[PDB]
Structure 1
Amino acid sequence: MFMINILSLIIPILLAVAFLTLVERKVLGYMQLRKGPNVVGPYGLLQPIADALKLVTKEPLRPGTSSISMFIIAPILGLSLALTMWVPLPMPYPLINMNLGVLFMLAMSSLAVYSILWSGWASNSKYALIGALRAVAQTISYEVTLAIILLSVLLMNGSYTLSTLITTQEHIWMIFTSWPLAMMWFISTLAETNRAPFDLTEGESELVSGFNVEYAAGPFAMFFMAEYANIIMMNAFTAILFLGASHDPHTPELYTINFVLKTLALTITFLWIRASYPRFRYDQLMHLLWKSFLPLTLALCMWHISLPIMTASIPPQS
């Protein structure tokens, strides 16, 4: 039944990703005074299934200038890592209770850029290569602050194991202790997931479709799978880190409900900001971080390095 657990961490996640599209097209549309998908069955509850069916029966053309091998290996890489990075999350009890869950998730998040990289390069297009390079710059810039902010926040945890965060936020949310970093962290989660207002890798206005421009039918749906699974997992990680929740050891369902609600709220804020801003211009989102996020996060790193020592509050490692 370990296989049972693995399948229970995949099919529900894929279904949640599918309904993420519907809730996005509804919440966004209601921001814009529209109604969003409404025709298919009741309240559009069948749109994810409908376009899921289309994308896997529509013809998946392969460009004549493509590089077949990487053009195919990129979607597999993206979806596999997006699904894999769900396994160490401490949803009541993590499926894979790793001693270095944070470092593992950082490693797989850094690997996920390589899907974009190989898909963009192998497609043999001007727009695709442009989007690949914008992805290069964006993810390096934001990865530096991702690592520093994770270190600064986890300095109060005592280790990198995800489960102890629940023990850390037993009496107070961690956001009340590191609300500045949290802000920056949230922005980083917006950019690493390659979402608005940093969704310049796609750049629908200026890059048509970015690195998905030559991706059609199944591979495109699969890259979308990776993107939305990453969105939900990032919001889940943010909820785990800062907005901790009560965990009764006898009824983990309470912590499941609270955690799921917090992830839902964070994702809803993601769609909220997606429908309330213009889009950044490449270098700006770099000049935002290398000149405003990086110094502030370095200073906060020193502050959180010193803070347990000056107050005799060094958390235990076990």
Structure 2
Amino acid sequence: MFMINVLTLIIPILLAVAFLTLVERKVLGYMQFRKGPNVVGPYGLLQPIADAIKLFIKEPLRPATSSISMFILAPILALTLALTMWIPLPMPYPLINMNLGVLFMLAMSSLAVYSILWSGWASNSKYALIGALRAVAQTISYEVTLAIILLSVLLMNGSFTLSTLIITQEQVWLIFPAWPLAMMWFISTLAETNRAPFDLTEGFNVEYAAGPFALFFMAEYANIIMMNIFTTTLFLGAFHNPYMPELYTINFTIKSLLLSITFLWIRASYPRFRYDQLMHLLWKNFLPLTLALCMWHVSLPILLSSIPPQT
């Protein structure tokens, strides 16, 4: 009965990642004054299935790998860490209800750079290795402000429990007392997944075939949907009636779709940063403000007597 619940989590994740490609191409279509896919299925609803069957029978490149084991374990780790970030997410009750789900997600996302690094070393190219090292440096850079912003917000929560984060926001959204943390969190999650305007990989895993590239691709989009849902729970937490959980489920679904389309609407609006310009954005703009707001959200529940409950 629990394995049924694991399958009903992981199969709709893959279906939602499949149709996120359609939603991305349609929304980027209409924002670019054009249409997106509408020929393949009715209004394009068979374009993800056609793209998947195309990528999964495409020829493997016969890759001259510098290692077998890291070449295989980078998509495996990418998909496993793409799926295991979902299991503490409260929707309104998670698959794995754990007391440290926030810290669990921060740890499993900090482990997600090894897929990039092992894909980089598993290629023979020095240029692909340089691009992978740049991507790893970018991602571990923005994980710093992920951790500090996340800590600063959870100083209003009481604990690292994600289900408690629904109880915290029953009177007001947590974007009202923490909107600078919200906007820096949102740009930081934008810069984690190498999403535009932080996508200098399209400006490292091309040693793979088109199939394993589809695996890294769907792991990246599962991370995009997951960080949008986690931002929804973290700042725009919905109303929850324990006798009708579908109210919370429809509410955070609508907010997660709007935030994912906000990613799609940011990527069709801005040019890319140069690499040192987003290192400047992290280390010289987001990090002083983030440390000051960390001091502020430490010392503020003490001065307002609004220290949240531990339990």
TM-score normalised by length of structure 1: 0.96
Q: How does 1:1-318 map to 2 (within 5 A)?
A: 1-200=1-200, 202=201, 204-205=202-203, 211-318=204-311
Kept in 2, the 8 Å contact 1:152–1:305? The answer is yes
Aligned equivalents of 2:148, 2:80: Cα separation in 1: 26
Which runs of 5 or more structure 2 residues have no equivalent in the other structure?
Answer: none
Aligned equivalents of 2:2, 2:14: Cα separation in 1: 19
Aligned equivalents of 1:47, 1:135: Cα separation in 2: 30
Structure 1 residue runs of 4 or more that deviate by more than 2 Å after TM superposition: none
Identity %: 87
Aligned equivalents of 1:137, 1:151: Cα separation in 2: 22
Aligned length: 311
Aligned equivalents of 2:237, 2:193: Cα separation in 1: 22
Aligned partner of 1:36: which letter? G
Kept in 1, the 8 Å contact 2:63–2:208? The answer is no
Aligned equivalents of 2:151, 2:173: Cα separation in 1: 17
**Offset, 1:65:** 4.2
Kept in 2, the 8 Å contact 1:127–1:213? The answer is no
TM-score normalised by length of structure 2: 0.98
Render the CA deviation track for 1:20-49: whole Å, top value 9, x for unaligned.
000001100111111011111201000111
Aligned equivalents of 1:116, 1:157: Cα separation in 2: 33
- What is the CA RMSD across the aligned residues, in angstroms? 0.9
Aligned equivalents of 2:42, 2:120: Cα separation in 1: 38
Which runs of 5 or more structure 1 residues have no equivalent in the other structure?
Answer: 206-210
Aligned equivalents of 1:127, 1:45: Cα separation in 2: 38
